[PDB]
Amino acid sequence: GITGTWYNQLGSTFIVTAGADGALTGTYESAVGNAESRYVLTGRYDSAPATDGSGTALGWTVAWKNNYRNAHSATTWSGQYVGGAEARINTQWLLTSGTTEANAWKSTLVGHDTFTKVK
Amino acid sequence: GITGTWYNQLGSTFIVTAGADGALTGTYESAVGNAESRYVLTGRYDSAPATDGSGTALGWTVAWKNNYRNAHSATTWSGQYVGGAEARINTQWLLTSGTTEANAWKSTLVGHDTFTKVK
Amino acid sequence: GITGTWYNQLGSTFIVTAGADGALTGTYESAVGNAESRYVLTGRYDSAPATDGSGTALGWTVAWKNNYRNAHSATTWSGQYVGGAEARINTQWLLTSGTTEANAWKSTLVGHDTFTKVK
Amino acid sequence: GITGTWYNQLGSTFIVTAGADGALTGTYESAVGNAESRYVLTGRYDSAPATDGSGTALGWTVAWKNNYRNAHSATTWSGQYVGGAEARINTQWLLTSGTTEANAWKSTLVGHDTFTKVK
Locate the Avidin-like domain: which residues (chains A, B, C, D)? Predict the structure, then answer.
């Protein structure tokens, strides 16, 4: 049930497709990265998660480059998909903007974003 | 110069291939996640980084599962590739193990790993 | 308005006192660290935040040692206090358990905890 | 052996005093936060760490405000002190700048800083 279209609390939509081998592909839009543009996402997840009831570990990388804009930065999400009546993707993300060696200390951000299927 | 075989300070080898579209593919081995096994990695990077001299924003996801072992966890690296006389990949990473809703607060780890081409 | 008693979404209570010099003192309880025990907290904040409307940069650390239990770990919170009709403390935290040099890669956790005044 | 004057890889000096109760006090200087200014630090650590050989859990908060400069920011270090022939403090830090609700996603930074006693 991981495949689908997901939305975060800031409105950023997360269209994702899961493969049987554990692949993860999709797109990203809506502000937080860049205002209105498509960004290609790719990551991985485990195809055989625990059967006792537990979040499905997954993650994906989105580098903000496309045919229009390029912020020289990538946010790489890492969380687990919690199934149930309402599907949830609670993730922690690290936006790493490409900086010089002097500014490399302030290059990487960190945060959290929770994704739901309804919006 | 981003494509190649990379090693972290703990000995974990990071074989990576970069595509012209910004794709990032490879494998991960050597202990830190699991002792001796191949793990598929996929991520992204910007194909047109800044020309003034700056790290190339990149990232990759590795869900720790293969044909042999499955730790129900995904380790997700996010950093920038710094070129020069010696190539360097300074990254922050978030290993998110799949846990229950009760243990979801202790699911995600954070760290750093720097990758060089020589070992 | 930063001083008070705060609660996170997991029920952990955050009693805090702010000083005019920017000091931050209080206690921490309720499960997430240890089941039922008082833990001393100390941190800092800026006593002259921006007047245009912005979160107040604050942070604190709690090391789980007391007269009863000792987990050899510290979670060190860093966030900003957002004032308004409902007071909010949105924080990111890093639980660093004391490990050996071999396990030092898995020592530090990361997460988020939001604190409100009502519970 | 935790009390002393510590230096990170980027020249930032970390003068710290530890108390028997587990307290932690000191100052911070040298660029990364602000170019040349004193910044008050206070934190905590466990006074009874493991005796089998392991890092001593510690943390501290520094809010960049003083009598001269105020960046409305706090970097809140969380790491363990590793003793031995050379004393080491390997820490992860989260710099949270006080931002508005719109910019609150890009408020918190993440990184690492290792502190040694020699410089």
Answer: 1-119
Task: Name the minimum distance, in Å, from the CA of A108 to any CA of chain C.
Answer: 14
Q: Are B3 and B112 in contact (CB under 8 A)?
A: no
* Cβ neighbours of B48 (radius 10 Å): 10
Q: How many CA within 13 A on the CB side of residue C58?
A: 31
- CA–centroid distance for A12 within its chain: 10
C112/A111 Cβ within 8 A: yes
Alpha carbons within 13 A on the beta-carbon side of B36: 0
Q: What are the tokens at D35?
A: 């170019």
Domain boundaries defined on chain B? 1-119
Report the residue count for chain C: 119
Residue D106 is given by DSSP the state: G
CA dihedral C21, C22, C27, C29 (to 10 degrees): 170
DSSP E strand stretches across D1-119: 4-8, 13-18, 23-28, 39-45, 56-65, 70-82, 88-97, 111-116
Instruction: Give the pair of three-digit tokens for residue D105.
Output: 């996603």
Helix (H, G, I), strand (E, B) or coil at A38: coil
Which member of A54, A75, A98 has the closest CB to residue B98? A54
CA distance from start to end of chain C: 17
- C→A interface, C-beta within 8 Å: 92, 110-112
| Cα separation, C30 vs C18, whole angstroms | 21
Q: What is the C-alpha to C-alpha distance for residues A16 and A41, in angstroms, rounded to an integer?
A: 8
Residues D62, C44: contact at Cβ < 8 Å?
Answer: yes
Q: What are the backbone angles phi and psi of residue C32, rounded to the nearest 5°?
A: -40, -45
Chain C residues closer than 8 Å to D107 by CB: 55, 80
CATH of domain D1-119: 2.40.128.30
Place of tokens 């012209």: B20
Length, in residues, of chain B:
119
What type of residue is B114?
T
Which method, experimentally, gave rise to this model? cryo-EM
Name the residue of chain D whose CA is nearest to A106's CA.
D109
The Cα of D110 is separated from the nearest Cα of chain A by a number of Å equal to: 5
State the CB neighbour count (10 A cutoff) for residue A15: 16
Please give the C-alpha separations between residue B117 and each of A74, B6, C1, C63, in angstroms, as whole numbers: 22, 5, 52, 39
